[PDB]
Specification:
part of a larger assembly; 5 chains; about 50 residues; mainly alpha; 3 helices; about 70% helix; binds a molecule of 2 linked components (NAG-NAG); binds 2-acetamido-2-deoxy-beta-D-glucopyranose; Spike protein S1 (chain D)
């Protein structure tokens, strides 16, 4: 009872690293490199994946 | 000749910092428990350069002095020469060619600076000639096999040459021993300690037992 | 979503503290950057022996490129060309030829 | 200035888009243009616009 | 302009060899002739030709994207450094918000960044002066209300 839940809380952190097929995992790079007209094609994938 | 590798050849995957964690990655490494060619000094031929080379040397008077890389060797390829006692590396990268029996009695870069072990890894990727190096004294002295233990390597030099390479030869002095090992793509797991150094690595392509460790 | 609240406890939202200042930091290199030597040079090399140049340790300004005549092709892959002035780079390689 | 209609049109930021005439991203409308180089061209250039 | 060669090239490579292309079945043996063509040819350019054949000058750039100590970027000016307060910061194109304080982590001379489990940035090195800093998110929490009957 003390073990399983702890593990079920760790994995949720690790899923924050996957890229979900986007350009980069870090959320600031997309807005610091691309343009507003086209960043919406990318942000959607991350939002859905999380 | 032939001799056991005995768990050597691990280098940093990138220039980032971590601490107290387990990580997994894939790159061109040297598989554990791999037989390695052996030579003695007088027997100094040209050896293949398939996909990167692991080079290691035992000496104390620095007989080994340079390398030559090329395909046809008609005075139209790069070479590397050094003048170093123990810790003073001097590099010239011009295209001078010696005679057909080299020995010791664009130039995009230039630099001037028993109880020894030299280790190097040469890698070629996308027009880049990456060179990783490591120096370490050995308290083992002469025995039958290569020194035991574990360590890590560091990245040193990059060069944007961009030429197809197939064969290489070493440069010796005349008036010590060395080894050659081949690279291979593979996936490992590593442990980053508390103080920021690599202390243990695990394969998951060697034995049935290790696959469980890799997947767990 | 009502005009009446029963006795008890409730949880509404969260709170976060706000910043008060802005900080930027950059290296103090102040050498003019030699883009002149390649763009408006006299004679370019041949395709089969294409020429390349290395650029490092300089302060860039990508707006001056607009001083030229109406271009035929000016495109970029991976970076929007407008904000090029807001990113820092390690090494620059530039290739030139004529087609 | 011809293609500067793109600046008049919703999209990326620029001098004409922001400091001369702007249209929001959610704007509903149309932009039409006729090549006036056949007519507006004059001897030694035209300097009647700023 | 190159015309003939046995097979294509890997990206970022050059070849200026003068070997004769063995087009025919006979072995040329380094002798130019029929079915043994010279690898290179020449173009032509006249001022009265059409735009379809006029010469064009082409330049290609290439980038590296902050994977090492950076050396080239714009003329943005620096500022004095403040710590122990909740501040917005920008280090070499890496933007963030939080609190900066002195730390004691030891790095190898070539290192430049520090990460963690969530791949977020934790420790940076000031390019202006060689010393190490870390980042801590600013304080936040949840709120609740207790009330009797209205
Ligand atoms: C560098 O060039 C050599 C030849 O110039 C390539 O060698 C080829 O090797 C394969 C594998 O045995 C042969 O099937 C080919 O016939 C060889 N080429 C020729 C022209 O005979 C070598 O592959 C090149 N390097 C790389 C990385 O591709
Ligand atoms: C990692 O480095 C730390 C220092 O940053 C080492 O901890 C110190 O060890 C010395 C012994 O050589 C003690 O005298 C100090 O008191 C220790 N520091 C503290 C804060 O207690 C640590 O030993 C190193 N890691 C390993 C495995 O040796
Ligand atoms: C390597 O070469 C030696 C030479 O005798 C041989 O005995 C061995 O089976 C080979 N393979 C491995 C994995 O050691
Ligand atoms: C500029 O940067 C160098 C880089 O180390 C630093 O040593 C120096 O103190 C800085 N300031 C001046 C005025 O040179
Ligand atoms: C190249 O020369 C032209 C000459 O008119 C000049 O306008 C242009 O700015 C120069 N290029 C650079 C990068 O300065």
């Amino acid at each position: 009872v003390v073990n399983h839940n702890a593990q079920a809380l760790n994995t949720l952190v690790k899923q924050l690293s996957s890229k979900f097929g986007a350009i980069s995992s870090v959320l600031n790079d997309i807005f610091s490199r691309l343009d507003p007209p086209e960043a919406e094609v990318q942000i959607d994938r991350l939002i859905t994946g999380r | 000749a032939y001799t056991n590798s005995f768990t050597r050849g691990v280098y940093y995957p990138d220039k980032v910092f971590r601490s107290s964690v387990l990580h997994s990655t894939q790159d061109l490494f040297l598989p554990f428990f791999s037989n390695v060619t052996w030579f003695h000094v007088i027997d100094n031929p040209v050896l293949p350069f398939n996909d990167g080379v692991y080079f290691a040397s035992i000496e104390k008077s620095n007989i080994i002095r340079g390398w030559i890389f090329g395909t046809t060797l008609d005075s139209k390829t790069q070479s590397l020469l050094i003048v170093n006692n123990a810790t003073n590396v001097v590099i010239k990268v011009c295209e001078f060619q010696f005679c057909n029996d080299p020995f010791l009695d664009n130039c995009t870069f230039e630099y001037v600076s028993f109880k020894n072990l030299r280790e190097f890894v040469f890698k070629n990727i996308d027009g880049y000639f990456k060179i990783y190096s490591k120096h370490t004294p050995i308290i083992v002295e002469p025995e039958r096999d290569l020194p035991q233990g574990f360590s890590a390597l560091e990245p040193l030099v990059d060069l944007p040459i961009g030429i197809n390479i197939t064969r290489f030869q070493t440069l010796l002095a005349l008036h010590a021993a060395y080894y050659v090992g081949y690279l291979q793509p593979r996936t490992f797991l590593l442990k980053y300690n508390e103080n920021g150094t690599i202390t243990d690595a695990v394969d998951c392509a060697l034995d049935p037992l290790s696959e469980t460790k890799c997947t767990l | 979503k009502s005009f009446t609240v029963e006795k008890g406890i409730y949880q509404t939202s969260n709170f976060r503290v706000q910043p008060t200042e802005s900080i930027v930091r950059f290296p103090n290199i102040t050498n003019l950057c030699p883009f002149d030597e390649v763009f408006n040079a006299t004679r370019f090399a041949s395709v089969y022996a294409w020429n390349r140049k290395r650029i490092s340790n300089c302060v860039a300004d990508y707006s001056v490129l607009y001083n030229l005549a109406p271009f035929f092709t000016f495109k970029c892959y991976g970076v929007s060309p407008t904000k090029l002035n807001d990113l820092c780079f390690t090494n620059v390689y530039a290739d030139s030829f004529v087609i | 200035r011809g293609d500067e209609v793109r600046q008049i049109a919703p999209g990326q930021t620029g001098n004409i888009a922001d400091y001369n005439y702007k249209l929001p991203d959610d704007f509903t409308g149309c932009v039409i243009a006729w090549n006036s180089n056949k007519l507006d061209s004059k001897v030694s250039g035209n300097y009647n616009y700023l | 302009y190159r015309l003939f060669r046995k097979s294509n090239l890997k990206p970022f490579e050059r070849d200026i060899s003068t070997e004769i292309y063995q087009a025919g079945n006979k072995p040329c043996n380094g002798v130019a002739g029929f079915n043994c063509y010279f690898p290179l040819k020449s173009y032509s350019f006249r001022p009265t030709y059409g735009v379809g054949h006029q010469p064009y000058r082409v330049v290609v750039l290439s980038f590296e994207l902050l994977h090492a100590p950076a050396t080239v970027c714009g003329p943005k000016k620096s500022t004095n450094l403040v710590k122990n307060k909740c501040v917005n910061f920008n280090f070499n194109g890496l933007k963030g918000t939080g609190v900066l304080t002195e730390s004691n982590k030891k790095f190898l001379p070539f290192q430049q960044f520090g990460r963690d489990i969530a791949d977020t940035t934790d420790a940076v090195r000031d390019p202006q002066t060689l010393e190490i800093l870390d980042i801590t998110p600013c304080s936040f929490g949840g709120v609740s209300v207790i009330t009797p009957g209205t």
